[PDB]
Design a protein around this ligand. Sequence first.
Ligand code: ADP
Ligand code: MG
Ligand code: MG
Ligand code: MG
Length: 319
Amino acid sequence: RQIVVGICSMAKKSKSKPMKEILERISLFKYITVVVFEEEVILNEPVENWPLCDCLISFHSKGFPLDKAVAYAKLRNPFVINDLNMQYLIQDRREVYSILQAEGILLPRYAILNRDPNNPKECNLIEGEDHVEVNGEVFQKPFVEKPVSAEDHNVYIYYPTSAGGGSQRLFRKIGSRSSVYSPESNVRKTGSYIYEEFMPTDGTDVKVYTVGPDYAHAEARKSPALDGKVERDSEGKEVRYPVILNAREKLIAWKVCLAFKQTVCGFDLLRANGQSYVCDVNGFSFVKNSMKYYDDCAKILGNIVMRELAPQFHIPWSI
Ligand SMILES: Nc1ncnc2c1ncn2[C@@H]1O[C@H](COP(=O)(O)OP(=O)(O)O)[C@@H](O)[C@H]1O
Ligand SMILES: [Mg+2]
Ligand SMILES: [Mg+2]
Ligand SMILES: [Mg+2]
């Protein structure tokens, strides 16, 4: 009899190349069978009809019924790789930053502007031509403005008058672009936002991908905070740069993975001013186009499953 690992996510994710690469490798474990829950079943069937599993790998993305995944986990009590309730919090940048602070993790100085959509002028914002004051806290330009929804990627950077003013509007990468300059110098006046200090990097962001708290792959890409043209190679793949995490950063990854209870977890680091600042925690995310990562990730995940469950299945497993 096999230990069943259930994969529960939207089809765009469950059928993605990186997912398939990892699942084929997990299936190589003699005592593990992988079951990928059909999207039609996730959306349309009650949880009582979902397939059984002993270990559940499940994560929210656009369109995913997290309430149902939570109810399923409560019903069946599988070993859960990425905690489901924490995925409600990962959707809200305010909650993410609160957790990071509680863990003593360095992050940009920030302030939350909560705006009542019925009374949008009543919020705690004062605006000058070269700064904002949010709950009384001053942010001189350049500063960053992020929608409180972590699913909203319309992050704006505001340039100081000394640099010509205006703003950089970032967005989910569309073909050749990740951002565009706007002459608009004043901040958005509807919605709630986090305002934060701009951290000067060498022009790259470091992307970190954990598989448990003791494995983290990192790589760098050109910051969209720059001009916004995406760098691509011959095959049309976005250019990435090699990164090795230092001791401080390996600890950050350990903390993020455990604090958010996401075994598989992606987050962003800004290397600025001799330190490394977390600016974004995304939860479930795989590295793409690395055979070594696919090998390592599947081995780690299978080993986690076996360590946890081999005893109750009476399967021999050493340490
Ligand atoms: N405080 C900051 N200082 C400098 N750059 C930042 C800062 N915050 C975010 N950025 C830039 O904006 C990009 C997008 O912001 P991020 O918080 O990662 O939002 P998203 O969830 O949309 O990926 C980051 O990858 C980084 O290039
Ligand atoms: Mg197998
Ligand atoms: Mg990000
Ligand atoms: Mg994000």
